[PDB]
Design an enzyme around this catalytic site. Structure first.
Site, short mmCIF file in Angstrom:
data_model
loop_
_atom_site.label_atom_id
_atom_site.label_comp_id
_atom_site.label_asym_id
_atom_site.label_seq_id
_atom_site.Cartn_x
_atom_site.Cartn_y
_atom_site.Cartn_z
N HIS A 45 9.29 -36.87 17.66
CA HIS A 45 10.02 -35.91 16.83
C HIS A 45 10.78 -34.89 17.67
O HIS A 45 11.69 -34.25 17.19
CB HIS A 45 9.08 -35.29 15.82
CG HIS A 45 8.23 -34.15 16.25
ND1 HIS A 45 6.87 -34.23 16.50
CD2 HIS A 45 8.56 -32.84 16.48
CE1 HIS A 45 6.41 -33.03 16.84
NE2 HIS A 45 7.45 -32.18 16.85
N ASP A 93 4.36 -41.08 16.78
CA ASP A 93 5.07 -39.91 17.26
C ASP A 93 4.97 -39.82 18.78
O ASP A 93 4.20 -39.07 19.38
CB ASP A 93 4.56 -38.62 16.60
CG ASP A 93 5.53 -37.43 16.79
OD1 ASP A 93 6.61 -37.67 17.38
OD2 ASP A 93 5.16 -36.31 16.34
N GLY A 186 6.56 -25.70 19.31
CA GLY A 186 6.96 -25.62 20.71
C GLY A 186 5.92 -26.22 21.63
O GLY A 186 6.23 -26.46 22.83
N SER A 188 4.53 -29.19 20.69
CA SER A 188 4.70 -30.63 20.40
C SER A 188 5.20 -31.37 21.62
O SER A 188 6.00 -30.83 22.37
CB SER A 188 5.67 -30.85 19.24
OG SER A 188 5.15 -30.36 18.03
N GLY A 189 4.69 -32.58 21.74
CA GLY A 189 5.07 -33.43 22.83
C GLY A 189 4.23 -33.27 24.09
O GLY A 189 4.20 -34.15 24.94
#
Ligand code: NA
Length: 240
Positions: A45, A93, A186, A188-189
């Site tokens: 995402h 994801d 912020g 995420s990932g």
């Protein structure tokens, strides 16, 4: 990260900052994990938008010169072919970013260790989330890299009706949910680092929090389970 503490500069050398070009500036948007000198693992995402992205390795303070950063463009984006941006709860994801250059390894820049395929952590396993995400629900990004202790919440608990119910899948890891500490926007990932047989490994890629808030009791932060994707990762790197 809500309820975190400032990480030591050399604790999490596989963490990267994924940034996009914003006017004459760069803006942090997500974390990631350096997994080869020219590949970063992040959330799909994070790269939905058609932006110019760069990775920063060796980053500690987004707002100050650390003297350790390496800045590298993103050359190719490979999103899991099953990802659907309108359905984060379906899973998938995860995305890999091939860097324009191979970065140089040092005590601030190291490859993240991934778990063996199929590994599932016992409930309440010790982990840290790291990132520069919001330090409060509807707050602002951290300046310095934050860590928070977020023990895992196994599938059977996490998929129970007072936790996430059907929204969580076995392809995900849940961690935290104490109402104080959490991932936030912020983060995420980025990685979830879990201590297993004495070694930290990156078991999660931060995926989502509740729409109600970051640190919400019985809504642990949800991560893509890295150990479900080892063959996918290896197939993408080998073919790219
Ligand atoms: Na910096």
């Amino acid at each position: 990260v809500v309820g975190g503490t400032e990480a030591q500069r050399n604790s999490w050398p596989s963490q990267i900052s994924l940034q996009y070009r914003s006017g004459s500036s760069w803006a942090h948007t997500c974390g990631g994990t350096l997994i080869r000198q020219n590949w970063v693992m992040t959330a799909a995402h994070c790269v939905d938008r058609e932006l110019t992205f760069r990775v920063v390795v060796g980053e500690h303070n987004l707002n100050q010169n650390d003297g350790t950063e390496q800045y590298v463009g993103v050359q190719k984006i490979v999103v899991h072919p099953y990802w659907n941006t309108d359905d984060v709860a379906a899973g998938y994801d995860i995305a890999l970013l091939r860097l324009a250059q191979s970065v140089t390894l040092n005590s601030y820049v190291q490859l993240g260790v991934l778990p063996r395929a199929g590994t599932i952590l016992a409930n309440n396993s010790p982990c840290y989330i790291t990132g520069w995400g919001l330090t409060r629900t509807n707050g602002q990004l951290a300046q310095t890299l934050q860590q928070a202790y977020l023990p895992t919440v196994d599938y059977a608990i996490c998929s129970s009706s007072s936790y996430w119910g059907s929204t969580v899948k076995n392809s995900m890891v849940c961690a935290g949910g104490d109402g104080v500490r959490s991932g936030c926007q912020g983060d995420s990932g980025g990685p979830l680092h879990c201590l297993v047989n004495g070694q930290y490994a990156v078991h999660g890629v931060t995926s989502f929090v509740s729409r109600l808030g970051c640190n919400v009791t019985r809504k642990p932060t949800v991560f893509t389970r890295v150990s479900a994707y080892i063959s996918w990762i290896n197939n993408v790197i080998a073919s790219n």
